[PDB]
Each structure stands twice: as structure tokens, then as C-alpha cells.
Write a protein that binds this ligand. Sequence first.
Ligand SMILES: [Mg+2]
Ligand SMILES: [Mg+2]
Ligand SMILES: [Mg+2]
Ligand SMILES: [Mg+2]
Ligand SMILES: [Mg+2]
Ligand SMILES: [Zn+2]
Lengths: 50, 44, 136, 175, 112
Amino acid sequence: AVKRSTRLGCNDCREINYLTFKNVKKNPEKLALNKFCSRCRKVVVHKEVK
Amino acid sequence: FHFPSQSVSFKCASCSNSFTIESTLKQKEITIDICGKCHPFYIG
Amino acid sequence: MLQPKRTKYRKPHNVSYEGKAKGNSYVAFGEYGLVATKGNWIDARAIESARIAISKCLGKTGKMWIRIFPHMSKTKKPLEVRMGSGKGNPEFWVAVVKQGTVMFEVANIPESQMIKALTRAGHKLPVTWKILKREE
Amino acid sequence: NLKAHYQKTIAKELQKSFAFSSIMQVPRLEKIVINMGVGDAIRDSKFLESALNELHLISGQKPVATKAKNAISTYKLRAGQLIGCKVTLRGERMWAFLEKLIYVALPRVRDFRGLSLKSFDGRGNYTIGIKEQIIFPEIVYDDIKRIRGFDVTLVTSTNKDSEALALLRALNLPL
Amino acid sequence: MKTRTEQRRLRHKRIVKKIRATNHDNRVVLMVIKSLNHISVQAWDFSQNIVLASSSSLALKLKNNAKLVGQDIADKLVKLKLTNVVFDTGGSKYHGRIAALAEAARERGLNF
RNA sequence: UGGAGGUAAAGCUACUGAAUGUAUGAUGGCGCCACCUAGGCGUACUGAAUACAAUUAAACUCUGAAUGCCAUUUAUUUUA
RNA sequence: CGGUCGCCUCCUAAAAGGUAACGGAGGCGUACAAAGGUACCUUCAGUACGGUUGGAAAUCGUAUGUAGAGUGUAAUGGUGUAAGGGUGCUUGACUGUGAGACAUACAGGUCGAACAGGUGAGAAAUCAGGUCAUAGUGAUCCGGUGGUCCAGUAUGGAAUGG
RNA sequence: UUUGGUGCCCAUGUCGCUGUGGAAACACCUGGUUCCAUUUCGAACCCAGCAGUUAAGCACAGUGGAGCCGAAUGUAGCUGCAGUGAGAAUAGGAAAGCACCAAGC
Ligand SMILES: [Mg+2]
Ligand SMILES: [Mg+2]
Ligand SMILES: [Mg+2]
Ligand SMILES: [Mg+2]
Ligand SMILES: [Mg+2]
Ligand SMILES: [Zn+2]
């Protein structure tokens, strides 16, 4: 297999909410989206977590 | 949004005439040797 | 030897000839034609033998039209081998001939000579032949 | 402006030349395009910028560069890597950049004798090719390391080519 | 190539296809047709394919800043107590005259 | 009674492969002269493309059933 | 000895669905922060005439053509104003759920109206719970990592568990 | 009833050829200074104006050219030798049809 997935975590409360897929070999940039966070109850910026 | 076009003139050198339409506006009323009524295929 | 230059799929389903001649029902180019009364498979080798018989007996005056063609291939498992474990290689091509297909037909040469040419042809083919003439 | 001469005389002239009784059955010149085909940008010779700048210089239209719609392995042009450039100029610009050729440029050609006997499409178009862009006045001696020509077209609003003959003759083109 | 009017009819077909596929309620669609000389409106009640009301410059008006074709049709529909429509720009763009019509239509008791 | 479907059969200038003939003949090959390159001559032949006639197909389809199937109506029967 | 061992598409498969063989052909063990979502605009490839570099074939305008083009990829199905190409804005490639069905031995898989929270695009209706669809993956145990309106072998903590 | 708009129908609705008409309307057209816009451009989108136009689009009459549709008989397959019935081929049709709305009628 290839372990291409990755995990997004909120920055205010630092939980590890979301899971997605990203191909490092092309876009080395760290993803920074903004999605719903269950603890914070609103759309917060999520950034990647190892 | 483009180069500063304008209504530039011209200057004939042999036909004793003139033209004025548009070009780069840094050289208004420019003279050229072979004029509008110069080339034999144009007249004759 | 008549043989398609190249085919898509090398090992197809065998075509049963038990019918009444879809297509090629009637003679279409010459005055006389050879018809079958029992459908069968005649390979390229038999078409070659029939063609050369007609040509040899036809002389340098007339024309012969072959209507059928060995479109379909056919396989043959190599000898002294158990069954299963694959499908055998293709060996020889064959033209399916339903009952009543005008397969050979001749032109531009006297009557009796054409009848004799056709009889000399149909003895190479397995199908029980018959003689038909063009309509009008 | 050359448009002045047209809207002053040509309508009546070609209306009487052919029995029409419809003031605008006369052919109307609709657009002019300019193309060069800058294919010496295999990967990056000067990346087309010289062509863009010079074509901007000649015409008030801002040039646009087309991307390849094909894939060709014979060269380094496959599925992208924009080549060439294109101007489609009209309005006052169409009439004026036209005469600016015929009254300035073509007398400055290497040899301007005659054409247009067989260059019609047969549906009301015409084309002119130039082997070098250095001839035209709206440029200085400095250019790209190579000097290329131009491809210009005259398309009108008629499909019968003899009408295009009539329109271009009424406008004093070198036949 | 195209005739600037068959093309507009095509854009209208696109829009009406989206509407006829999406309109789950029976909301009456409000079609506006823009002509170079003036403008007209008609309110097609789909699911029966009949027309409910209409308006135009030809209601003894002038050449179309004539949002008056909005107030009158708003009045005619609110007299039919529907007041929940969906707008249809024909093939036009929701801008200029069409916008001036639609805003007038909204501000007199419509809901769309 | 309404409906999905793409079989049997049929058909192939209605596409995909295969493929027969006659007419027009390109691509070419045999020669062939000039000319050293741009090329001409008739081609016993291979046949672009088209027309006319005629063909084949499990993995070909412009077309296309019957039986079978699904659900429903009506009559009768069975409490599975 | 050799070959194969799961998953996906066609044919065989007999016009519903299913249907075996060491039967006939082929693919996968993904790819894309845009090839997602939304508004707006736009719609083939090819051939013929016409044109400097430029050639069979680049590009340019013109017509012609009814798909032979495109559709990330195997085959099939579907799709020419679309589900294809370009642009602006974003991240719904959401959280918590789930009536009712499909196909199923079990496990599992698939589709999904509708409801609440808080969003994106848009004038608005509307659309959006990943892509045109079909593969792209592997139970349990054990152990580790992050959060915690759980317990803490008398009590308070902790270790250890949940 | 005719003109314009538009939905339903998907070619017996097309593709084309020859003519006729444009008061009201539909486009053309005239300008781009405004709102807005082009991979660039008032081409297009979008404004605001109708001097000229029946040329073109639009409509109407005629056109059996291609394309399209296609009866009956007979046949092939079927399902217990009768009913079922196609395909292809043919005579031949065919210059669309159904509604609602605004105008002058
Ligand atoms: Mg069959
Ligand atoms: Mg998409
Ligand atoms: Mg995709
Ligand atoms: Mg995908
Ligand atoms: Mg304790
Ligand atoms: Zn958070």
C-alpha cells in the first residue's frame, strides 16, 4: 500500500478532528483549511498534524 | 491599460501629401521616404 | 489459400450452419451458380481446390466469381494431450456454408461447358451441390 | 481616417455599381486578425515576450497568446506551451491600422508589385503575409534575435468573392 | 456564426431546463424577455403550462428605466395570492434593466 | 392489461474489424527521359476515396420479435 | 512440475436478475487543493479552399460535418450547449443523525428523502455530506498516539484501564 | 384570425433552392460617456437612441434534390403447422403539429 492520507486538527482547541488525503510529492505546502469543529461549535481554521 | 495611442500625423517625402491616423504617439508627424502615392504598383 | 489478413479475436465461437442461408440465397453475377443442399464447413483448402478446378476447366475466355469466404477461424487441440488446461491454438480457416448459398458462379462461356465446369467444381466440396440459373 | 472615405463615397459607389437598391447589401469589412506563429519558443528562447511587445507596439489592441490545442512530439509542443500570438482589431482601429499598412508599410516592402489574383478564399476573405516585421514603422531596429513576419486577414460580410473584389478595388488595394 | 437571438433562446433553454428539473414546490416562474426596443414579462405557471399574468411596455408605456412593468405585475400576482415565485432572466443577464425590473418586483410584496 | 430489455432472426454507403466484383483511379512499384532537381509518359500489379451490385461476426448494431419476467385488474381456489 | 488463489468491466449468460469450467479478452492495489463545490460564459475532433518563417502535420480566419472529439486510467454504459473547455469565489473532500428500499446465509456492501447546528457559491430559487458511474483494498486480538461533562480495590491522588 | 413571445413535442418538425413582406412588433443599425464587459475587442455581454434597411435573421407561398418516415402481400424466426409475426425491399406520404399570453384585427 501507500500511506498517502493525512490528518487535520483545529488550532484553537488542538483536537485532531479531520482526516483527508494529500500527495506530498507535488504540493509540499501544509494544508490550512477552515471547517466545522465540534468542540468550538463553529468554522475554525484547521491545519495539518503529523 | 495599453500603450498611449493617439491621433498621430505623418509626412510624405516625395508625394507631397500627409496621413494622420494612429501609432505610438512619441513621434508625431513623422516623415517617411516612400509615400502613399509613391509605389509604382499603387499608381501606374 | 484464402485467409483474412488479420482478425480481432483469434479464438471465436463455432457458428452452426443449420439454417436456410441468410444471404447469398440467389445467384447474382453470372448465368449459372452452384447451390448447396446440406449446410457444412468448407475450409480454405477446399475453396482453393474448387477454384483451381473451375479455372483449369474454364479456358481463357470466361470468368468465375467466388461468393463465400473463410471469414471464421477454427481451432484444433494438439494430439496426445489430456483435455482441459486451456484452449488449443487456431489451425485452419473455414467458410460457413448454409443450405442454399450460391457459392460459385460462372460467366461468358457456352452453356454445356459451364455445367461441366460446375460439376467438376462441386465434387471437391462436401455439400451436396445443385445447379441454378440466373433469373430474368 | 480611411473610414471617412468609405462612409462618404463607397456606399453609393458600390450601390450603383451593382443593382441592389439596399444601402447595406454593399459588403462591409468586419474584422482583421494578426498572427505570427512564434514557434522558435521550443521551451524558452525568449518566451514570446518580444513578440508580444512588438505586436503591442504596432497595434493598439493588446496582444494575446494562444495555447496549443494539439500534442506534437516532432517538436517540444504538446498539450500546452502557448505559441504565437493573436490580435483581432476593429472599430476605428480596424479602419485605421488598415490604411496605415497600405499607405505606409507596403511601399516599404522589399518588392511590392502585385497579389490578390489567387489569394481569395472564394467566400469573401483575403490574406496578406509579411516575411519580416522590421519593415513596419511602429518598431525600432532592436527586436527579438530573430525577425519574423505577419499574417493579416480581411474578412467582409459577403460570401461571393467577386463582391470582395469590388470592395477591395473600391478601397484602392494593390492588385 | 450564431444570430444573437437563437443563442439567447439557447441560454433560455438552459435556464428553463434547470428550473423544470429543480422546482420541487409549484412556484410560478417569472420569465422576462429583453428586446432591443423594450421589455416584456410573463408568469408561466408550470405543472400546468398555462400563463397567469403578464406585462410589457405595450401597456401604453414608453420605450424601456421603465421598472413600471414590475409594480403592475407585482400587483396582478399579489391579487392571485401566490407571492412566492422564481425569477427567469430569459437568456439575459441579471443586470441593468433586468435588475431594475427584479428589484421593483421584489419590493412590492413578492418573495423570491 | 402497461412496462424494462437488445436475444433468435435480419442488416452493414447505420458505425467497428474481415471482405467479392465492375467503373473512376489516387498512394505507390516496374521501366523511363530530361535533369542532377523539380519533374512529365503508359502502367499486365497493390489498391486512397466514391458510386453500383453483393457478403460475415460470441466480445458489430440504424432496426428487432414470440416465450419468459414484473406489477396490476377480473373470476375461482388454497390458509398455506 | 507448470498456472492460479482477492477486487473491477465485457462476452460466454439462452432479449428481467442470476448462472460453472485450468472458457475467451483485459485492468486495480489509485489519481486531483483542483480533475472537489458553486455562479457565469462557451461546445467537437477531422477535411477543403486561403496564408512569411513553417515542413504531411504547430497557429491564423472561413466554411463543412452530426460525433469518428473529449470524458484523469482497463472495458462497458452514459454524456455533443452535457457529466466537455475557461473564469471569479471558496473548501459541503461538514458535524450529529436517519424514515424507506436494494442486494444479501452471516459478516459486510450500496442508495437515500427528511431533521437540527454552523458554513460556501449565488440577486434568488437552488446546489453542495467528494469527483459522470462501476474497482482502488484486509476481520479479531495485542500494543501505541490525541481528546475526555467515566471509573480510580479504605480515603486523597497516581499507575492501570474505559 | 395574422404578427411577436414561450412551453410541450423530437425530423412526416430538418438541411437546402426560388420568390413575397415588414404599420404595430422582431432584428439590423447608430454611438460607447456613464452600470458592466473581452484570455484582446462595445464582435459578444450591457447601456441609451431610432435617421436608413427588407439585404441577412423572422414569417409566408412554391420546391418530391439529399436526409427522414413507410402501408398491404409474401418470407425468416418463434409457440403449443394454424395463429404469431419482423428485418430488408416497395408503392407511397411528407415543405410539421398541440396549447397559453400581448397587440391590431
Ligand atoms: Mg444471428
Ligand atoms: Mg467536473
Ligand atoms: Mg474525476
Ligand atoms: Mg474517479
Ligand atoms: Mg483509593
Ligand atoms: Zn477546535
